[PDB]
Write a protein that binds this ligand. Sequence first.
Ligand SMILES: Nc1ncnc2c1ncn2[C@@H]1O[C@H](COP(=O)(O)OP(=O)(O)OP(=O)(O)O)[C@@H](O)[C@H]1O
Ligand SMILES: Nc1ncnc2c1ncn2[C@@H]1O[C@H](COP(=O)(O)OP(=O)(O)OP(=O)(O)O)[C@@H](O)[C@H]1O
Ligand SMILES: Nc1ncnc2c1ncn2[C@@H]1O[C@H](COP(=O)(O)OP(=O)(O)OP(=O)(O)O)[C@@H](O)[C@H]1O
Ligand SMILES: Nc1ncnc2c1ncn2[C@@H]1O[C@H](COP(=O)(O)OP(=O)(O)OP(=O)(O)O)[C@@H](O)[C@H]1O
Ligand SMILES: Nc1ncnc2c1ncn2[C@@H]1O[C@H](COP(=O)(O)OP(=O)(O)OP(=O)(O)O)[C@@H](O)[C@H]1O
Ligand SMILES: Nc1ncnc2c1ncn2[C@@H]1O[C@H](COP(=O)(O)OP(=O)(O)OP(=O)(O)O)[C@@H](O)[C@H]1O
Ligand SMILES: [Mg+2]
Ligand SMILES: [Mg+2]
Ligand SMILES: [Mg+2]
Ligand SMILES: [Mo]
Ligand SMILES: [Mo]
Ligand SMILES: [Mo]
Ligand SMILES: [Mo]
Ligand SMILES: [Mo]
Ligand SMILES: [Mo]
Ligand SMILES: [Mo]
Ligand SMILES: [Mo]
Ligand SMILES: [Mo]
Ligand SMILES: [Mo]
Ligand SMILES: [Mo]
Ligand SMILES: [Mo]
Ligand SMILES: [Mo]
Ligand SMILES: [Mo]
Ligand SMILES: [Mo]
Ligand SMILES: [Mo]
Ligand SMILES: [Mo]
Ligand SMILES: [Mo]
Ligand SMILES: [Mo]
Ligand SMILES: [Mo]
Ligand SMILES: [Mo]
Ligand SMILES: [Mo]
Ligand SMILES: [Mo]
Ligand SMILES: [Mo]
Ligand SMILES: [Mo]
Ligand SMILES: [Mo]
Ligand SMILES: [Mo]
Ligand SMILES: [Mo]
Ligand SMILES: [Mo]
Ligand SMILES: [Mo]
Ligand SMILES: [Mo]
Ligand SMILES: [Mo]
Ligand SMILES: [Mo]
Ligand SMILES: [Mo]
Ligand SMILES: [Mo]
Ligand SMILES: [Mo]
Ligand SMILES: [Mo]
Ligand SMILES: [Mo]
Ligand SMILES: [Mo]
Ligand SMILES: [Mo]
Ligand SMILES: [Mo]
Ligand SMILES: [Mo]
Ligand SMILES: [Mo]
Ligand SMILES: [Mo]
Ligand SMILES: [Mo]
Ligand SMILES: [Mo]
Ligand SMILES: [Mo]
Ligand SMILES: [Mo]
Ligand SMILES: [Mo]
Ligand SMILES: [Mo]
Ligand SMILES: [Mo]
Ligand SMILES: [Mo]
Ligand SMILES: [Mo]
Ligand SMILES: [Mo]
Ligand SMILES: [Mo]
Ligand SMILES: [Mo]
Ligand SMILES: [Mo]
Lengths: 245, 245, 245, 268, 268, 268
Amino acid sequence: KRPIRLLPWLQVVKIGGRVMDRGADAILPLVEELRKLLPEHRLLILTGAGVRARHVFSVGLDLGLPVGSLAPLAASEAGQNGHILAAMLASEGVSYVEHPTVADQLAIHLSATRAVVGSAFPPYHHHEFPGSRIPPHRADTGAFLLADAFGAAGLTIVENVDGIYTADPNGPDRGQARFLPETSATDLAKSEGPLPVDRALLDVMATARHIERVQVVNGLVPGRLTAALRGEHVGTLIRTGVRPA
Amino acid sequence: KRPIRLLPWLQVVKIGGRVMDRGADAILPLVEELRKLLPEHRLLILTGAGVRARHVFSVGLDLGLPVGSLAPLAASEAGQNGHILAAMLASEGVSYVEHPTVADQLAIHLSATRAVVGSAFPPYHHHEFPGSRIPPHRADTGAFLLADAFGAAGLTIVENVDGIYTADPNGPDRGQARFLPETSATDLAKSEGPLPVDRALLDVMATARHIERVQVVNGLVPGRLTAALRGEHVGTLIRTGVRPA
Amino acid sequence: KRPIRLLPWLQVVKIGGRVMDRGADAILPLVEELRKLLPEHRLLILTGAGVRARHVFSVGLDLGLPVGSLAPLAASEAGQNGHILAAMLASEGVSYVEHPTVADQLAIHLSATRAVVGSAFPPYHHHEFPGSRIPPHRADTGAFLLADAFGAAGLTIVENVDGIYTADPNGPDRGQARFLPETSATDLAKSEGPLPVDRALLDVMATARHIERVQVVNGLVPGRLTAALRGEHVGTLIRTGVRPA
Amino acid sequence: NSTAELEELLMQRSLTDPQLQAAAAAAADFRILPDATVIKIGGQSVIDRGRAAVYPLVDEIVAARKNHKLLIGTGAGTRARHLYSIAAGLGLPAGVLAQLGSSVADQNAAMLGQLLAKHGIPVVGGAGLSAVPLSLAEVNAVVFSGMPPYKLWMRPAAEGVIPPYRTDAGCFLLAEQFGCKQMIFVKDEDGLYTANPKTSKDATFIPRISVDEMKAKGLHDSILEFPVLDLLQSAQHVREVQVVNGLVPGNLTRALAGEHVGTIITAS
Amino acid sequence: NSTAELEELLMQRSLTDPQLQAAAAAAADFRILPDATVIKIGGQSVIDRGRAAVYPLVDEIVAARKNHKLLIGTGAGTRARHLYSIAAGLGLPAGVLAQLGSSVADQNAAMLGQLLAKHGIPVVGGAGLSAVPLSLAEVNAVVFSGMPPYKLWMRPAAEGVIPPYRTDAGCFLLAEQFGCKQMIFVKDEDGLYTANPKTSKDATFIPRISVDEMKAKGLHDSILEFPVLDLLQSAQHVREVQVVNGLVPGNLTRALAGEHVGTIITAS
Amino acid sequence: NSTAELEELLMQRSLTDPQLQAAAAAAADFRILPDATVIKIGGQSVIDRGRAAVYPLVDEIVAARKNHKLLIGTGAGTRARHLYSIAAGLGLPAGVLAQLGSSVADQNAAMLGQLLAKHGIPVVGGAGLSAVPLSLAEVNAVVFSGMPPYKLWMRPAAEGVIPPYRTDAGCFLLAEQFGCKQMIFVKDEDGLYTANPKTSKDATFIPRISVDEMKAKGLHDSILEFPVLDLLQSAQHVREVQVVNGLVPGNLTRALAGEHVGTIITAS
Ligand SMILES: Nc1ncnc2c1ncn2[C@@H]1O[C@H](COP(=O)(O)OP(=O)(O)OP(=O)(O)O)[C@@H](O)[C@H]1O
Ligand SMILES: Nc1ncnc2c1ncn2[C@@H]1O[C@H](COP(=O)(O)OP(=O)(O)OP(=O)(O)O)[C@@H](O)[C@H]1O
Ligand SMILES: Nc1ncnc2c1ncn2[C@@H]1O[C@H](COP(=O)(O)OP(=O)(O)OP(=O)(O)O)[C@@H](O)[C@H]1O
Ligand SMILES: Nc1ncnc2c1ncn2[C@@H]1O[C@H](COP(=O)(O)OP(=O)(O)OP(=O)(O)O)[C@@H](O)[C@H]1O
Ligand SMILES: Nc1ncnc2c1ncn2[C@@H]1O[C@H](COP(=O)(O)OP(=O)(O)OP(=O)(O)O)[C@@H](O)[C@H]1O
Ligand SMILES: Nc1ncnc2c1ncn2[C@@H]1O[C@H](COP(=O)(O)OP(=O)(O)OP(=O)(O)O)[C@@H](O)[C@H]1O
Ligand SMILES: [Mg+2]
Ligand SMILES: [Mg+2]
Ligand SMILES: [Mg+2]
Ligand SMILES: [Mo]
Ligand SMILES: [Mo]
Ligand SMILES: [Mo]
Ligand SMILES: [Mo]
Ligand SMILES: [Mo]
Ligand SMILES: [Mo]
Ligand SMILES: [Mo]
Ligand SMILES: [Mo]
Ligand SMILES: [Mo]
Ligand SMILES: [Mo]
Ligand SMILES: [Mo]
Ligand SMILES: [Mo]
Ligand SMILES: [Mo]
Ligand SMILES: [Mo]
Ligand SMILES: [Mo]
Ligand SMILES: [Mo]
Ligand SMILES: [Mo]
Ligand SMILES: [Mo]
Ligand SMILES: [Mo]
Ligand SMILES: [Mo]
Ligand SMILES: [Mo]
Ligand SMILES: [Mo]
Ligand SMILES: [Mo]
Ligand SMILES: [Mo]
Ligand SMILES: [Mo]
Ligand SMILES: [Mo]
Ligand SMILES: [Mo]
Ligand SMILES: [Mo]
Ligand SMILES: [Mo]
Ligand SMILES: [Mo]
Ligand SMILES: [Mo]
Ligand SMILES: [Mo]
Ligand SMILES: [Mo]
Ligand SMILES: [Mo]
Ligand SMILES: [Mo]
Ligand SMILES: [Mo]
Ligand SMILES: [Mo]
Ligand SMILES: [Mo]
Ligand SMILES: [Mo]
Ligand SMILES: [Mo]
Ligand SMILES: [Mo]
Ligand SMILES: [Mo]
Ligand SMILES: [Mo]
Ligand SMILES: [Mo]
Ligand SMILES: [Mo]
Ligand SMILES: [Mo]
Ligand SMILES: [Mo]
Ligand SMILES: [Mo]
Ligand SMILES: [Mo]
Ligand SMILES: [Mo]
Ligand SMILES: [Mo]
Ligand SMILES: [Mo]
Ligand SMILES: [Mo]
Ligand SMILES: [Mo]
Ligand SMILES: [Mo]
Ligand SMILES: [Mo]
Ligand SMILES: [Mo]
């Protein structure tokens, strides 16, 4: 049999670092939406890194540093985003928790309070895989690895775009970018262009044991996170290839 | 605008180290009073250092150590007082929490339980400010910095005297010591003699953003802490100079 | 007077490492029984080490290492057993907590959730006592030291046998092994043969201040742990020699 | 390429953008600990065997660090296999098993470290940046626990819940990240054979082979974790590894001296 | 005064008592690391500029530690300014911003430390008492993250929520606490000018000035955090600081050799 | 005996089995730090006395480490007695007092460590395996906090709640565990007397005595924690201890040189 689910009642929500980068104009509505979700779900909220990780990559690459040096440097920015988001939710009982706490004590922390925030980057650190000079196991990937290891009820990825397009919808070829309401990880894995999700996310989807679908939704549009957490189709659904037992 | 309040429903209570130094005769009634307060308030209880810090200052100064060495040595005594007080409240669900936990995870801990205890000293440590050979940022100061950063509903300081007098009421000039029911931080800051509160407390009051008043009350008189936490005037009120928005 | 009780409402349950060593066939029924106990008691569940500690003793002794080296090496196996057991109870809000957390923050953790798991070994580490080449302060002993320091309502030891016999009931002389429904620590301390409990357990019973009796019960028989936690006599009762005030 | 082109791409594109990926690949390449050798001391193959296996290797390490800067990582072994068996039987996932196995590598590092302490060689966390020990002739070596950090975030294998990245991968990736000059796995066989030498009587010794040749013969998961072979093919710095028998007196000393004992496995 | 008079006051008075304060001021004065120099490597002014700025300074540090014991602290820079902008726009208080900025100084210490690791120089916490590194000729230097520890207990400025004590203050206070002989700030300008040299075309270079003279001219918050100038006036041990241009080859080497490059700022 | 017989017993019996206990006792005996000496610097008897007592001992330590590898542990003293008094009066148990007393030994280690830092001698956790400091002539010594780790799991005494294992026991057990060659307690009296020399005017000095002789005379709980005497009788490695007066100039230097200052207390 597949491994048991550890926290089958958990919803995991990954907030993109580039959503946090928009500052109060994006963060305040998201925080209000999260506040209203606290009574409805048991939430692990994980933040990504965004633009400051690009800057530390710029410096680190100029200094010649290898990919295992760059991985924790980027992860730091995701942790800072998590501290910012948790501070905005502190009055509702929400705090940031560290990676060892997420890995070993999430059950008691979600018994103490309704949601906690953590960094979405996984602790690959100096043992990041070689090949690319850019750390491959980033925030989408970390959040999915946790959600699937826990056997969570879902993972929802909160982006600054409506979902996945056939080309970067903010890029040079944005004229030909068509929106994809639904896709499979295997179909995505064979495309070559950019995505709003880590390519390593598709890899960990292939070996997944529980999470059957992951929805990417626009966090800049109030109500889409709420709808996604109820299963409503409001962004791009990614089918992982996992089937029910 | 002023910064938001992080924990607007929090009451912070600072217990003087010299109250703890009186042992069971003072501590048992205080513990009984705190027990009865647990259902009424959400409490961060912070302990000061008392007489053992004077001893470690005696030794440290005789060894020539600088003020940044003495600061953590004194802080230790406040932490031990916090462990003693928390042990007496353990059967009610109360524990001591460390400074990083207070700084980053207080919201989840006060969701888990009704009160927690911490050290009132701030972590200035070897980066304590020079000038005096006695660490200036002590327990009153640390407790106020936290209360105001959190935007707490109040900070009450629990002393072994009724409040602030015009001279030390246990000192050589105690004959001329007149009780002050109310005072401002700026008026106190311009006086020269001793106080029952850190002089640095007056400084951090001047730059405060939220806490408008701090009451100093006699913890040796049962019921005064309870009354102060309801706003009743039973000791010395210190006006910080903060005004409502 | 004897010292006060810190957590008088606590039940401590020590799970033998050799019970965990039986794998799912033993662990799944125990986990189901513990799940049903969560609403009835406030539980500190502590795991022992079992057969992997014998292996690390084999290697460590062959390398000549002293008893203070072997103590933390064995303790590790008890911690791993605790992580395994906690994972099986995560969906009920249960996690493993570390020794400093058990020692200083158990009250807030049992306010957050109904049970937590920890390692039953005490942190004697490189300061383990000399004399035997086998660490004397092991899981039974650690669990008893905590239970008695906390003033817990009880300590129940969950074994892979019905209780204590006059000889090892799985050993060369098992033909003459008679079951003992009740015994005193002092009577046991004067016998010479093997026991299913640490000999140091009898020593810490002699200096105990609160725990009057400790029951050893068969965790392989469903319902015995439940019955023992209600005071029912279903294994071997060990009288510590403590009397009521 | 240029710094500017790279920083512009880093600001304006997804990290998944092929154009950005290619600009990053042209970056300078700094080796953090270029003069060090990473050694893995097997858990099942060496430390589990006790004194007869470990003491001579301790003497070799003590002698070798006179001429060679060493990062010495430990394997895990039979107690981790026991933990994996218990936890897999409960249905626990790979990420939970991964944490369990770390503890066993840690035990083994402790035991080795205590035999080395009087010789000035510490057990450390952060071996790759253990700058002070590695710069001293009195020291010149450190011991570390060989499991990778991934713990609950371990990627599972395609089948089963045994963690696929264990202490061969842990040690290899440290060598690769720190740009070390050499990676030596110390096990209990002379090197790679055409079949399992413990199982097959007429297995033929292979002195030198590429990862592709190993796969083409079906040796992907033999004396090394098969995922290490893939990591090796992607590596920037460590493009071959050597596998040696730590049970043969002096074998580690001789490999450090550039003797071709054992098997050399090449990325290409 | 006397030990007895002091211990009696320490037992019988508030720490706020002027009489006690004065007895304490007569205590002996021990310098913990008197032969060390604290250097701050700017975040925005140096490390954010990458290889062109950092590599020559790494070579200078490696050369300099042959003759000079160094505690090398990092600044934070543009990623901290970004964090401050986001968090201030949310209304977060100075204490929360302070924690955020620490992370950026830590990143920068990591990056510098990895370039220095093969030269034996570690990144440490507790630089002032990094007794072992600083006593070895093979080492003689450590790197540390320059933010102070105050975090949520940071005193805010009189206006706004930007933490007023950042990495200039962090480094300065470490020098002061450990009784170091010298404090050198390494930035990207030759020293202090009568106006911002990046902004003003005809700014005049100032080789030497007191804190009071700086305030009397309105230079309180220029190339140094203005709170550092006040800390400097209260300091027991470090009563002047030197500001130098790390972008000029050898400038750090020459300042360590007693050359008066840059600007010397005196407490009085 | 044999390895096999031992491993079979270890697998098949309770650890309480006399047969297993006896097979284990025949195991080889490795000494981890055989060339080191453990010294305890008294809390009440030395560090609480300040400069007059501590400075000369710092000079002795600095001189002595040229010829002698030292693990230097601190006692606790009057601030721990104050904590114990407060906590015992509240009815707190021995395990809670134990944690409180650790903090005071830690303070004292900090203060000693800061006087030693410029001489290259660190404060450490894990003194027994502080392999790097102890292997360097520039260092050759470390300072550690002398309380044992037992904290809430401290066994109480037969009467009362004062922790029975405090910093004499902490230091002794470290010496014993690491197989050190010598254990010297540095106090404020010349050694053991037939009665308390502070209390009794005509107490007679005892240069040498066994634990059994001490008990037979009623000296079980005098200048050493009485539980240390029992630990000493069970010890594998350290079978005598020396008690010396740290207030006498050079007394520590002379004890390290093999002079029989003070009292030697033997296990048998
Ligand atoms: N095929 C695509 N579909 C949608 N967006 C794309 C695609 N390719 C590139 N993008 C770009 O990805 C951007 C999202 O950026 P990215 O995924 O790096 O940010 P993030 O998820 O917030 O950051 P982090 O991964 O650190 O959390 C979109 O705004 C879009 O411009
Ligand atoms: N103007 C004053 N008004 C009232 N008390 C004063 C004044 N000046 C000095 N004191 C003295 O301050 C004493 C309180 O001592 P102090 O404030 O040091 O203790 P604490 O607050 O318990 O300690 P800690 O600051 O470590 O928590 C009073 O008992 C009084 O003798
Ligand atoms: N007098 C005795 N009565 C009962 N069991 C005994 C006795 N003497 C020896 N034993 C043996 O003790 C075994 C229990 O083993 P042990 O106490 O080591 O395991 P455990 O308590 O699970 O391990 P740990 O102490 O690591 O938690 C029993 O199965 C029995 O064979
Ligand atoms: N084709 C092969 N050639 C040589 N050895 C092989 C081959 N296939 C399997 N092996 C065996 O694989 C074993 C190496 O695996 P093992 O787990 O013992 O290494 P380890 O480094 O000790 O792992 P750990 O350190 O985690 O225990 C060798 O004992 C060897 O007999
Ligand atoms: N009067 C002045 N004279 C010289 N330089 C000035 C003056 N006023 C402002 N500056 C500028 O201040 C800058 C120093 O601040 P900056 O934040 O760059 O230092 P930093 O050490 O890099 O800070 P961090 O390290 O946290 O980034 C210099 O680049 C300089 O151009
Ligand atoms: N029979 C005796 N002979 C010599 N000294 C004795 C005797 N009985 C009691 N003492 C006293 O015991 C004292 C040692 O105890 P003390 O607590 O001072 O040691 P310490 O190492 O300073 O403890 P800590 O370090 O925790 O304070 C000595 O000052 C000595 O006067
Ligand atoms: Mg994205
Ligand atoms: Mg006061
Ligand atoms: Mg048992
Ligand atoms: Mo933490
Ligand atoms: Mo943690
Ligand atoms: Mo960890
Ligand atoms: Mo932790
Ligand atoms: Mo850890
Ligand atoms: Mo923690
Ligand atoms: Mo903690
Ligand atoms: Mo913590
Ligand atoms: Mo921290
Ligand atoms: Mo922590
Ligand atoms: Mo930390
Ligand atoms: Mo932890
Ligand atoms: Mo912890
Ligand atoms: Mo700890
Ligand atoms: Mo912690
Ligand atoms: Mo600690
Ligand atoms: Mo760990
Ligand atoms: Mo660890
Ligand atoms: Mo260790
Ligand atoms: Mo260690
Ligand atoms: Mo270390
Ligand atoms: Mo660790
Ligand atoms: Mo760790
Ligand atoms: Mo760690
Ligand atoms: Mo360290
Ligand atoms: Mo590191
Ligand atoms: Mo580390
Ligand atoms: Mo180190
Ligand atoms: Mo270090
Ligand atoms: Mo931190
Ligand atoms: Mo940190
Ligand atoms: Mo690092
Ligand atoms: Mo580091
Ligand atoms: Mo360190
Ligand atoms: Mo270290
Ligand atoms: Mo740290
Ligand atoms: Mo830290
Ligand atoms: Mo820390
Ligand atoms: Mo350290
Ligand atoms: Mo420190
Ligand atoms: Mo530290
Ligand atoms: Mo260090
Ligand atoms: Mo160290
Ligand atoms: Mo601690
Ligand atoms: Mo500590
Ligand atoms: Mo320290
Ligand atoms: Mo320290
Ligand atoms: Mo250390
Ligand atoms: Mo520690
Ligand atoms: Mo500790
Ligand atoms: Mo610790
Ligand atoms: Mo360390
Ligand atoms: Mo250790
Ligand atoms: Mo340690
Ligand atoms: Mo060390
Ligand atoms: Mo070190
Ligand atoms: Mo070290």
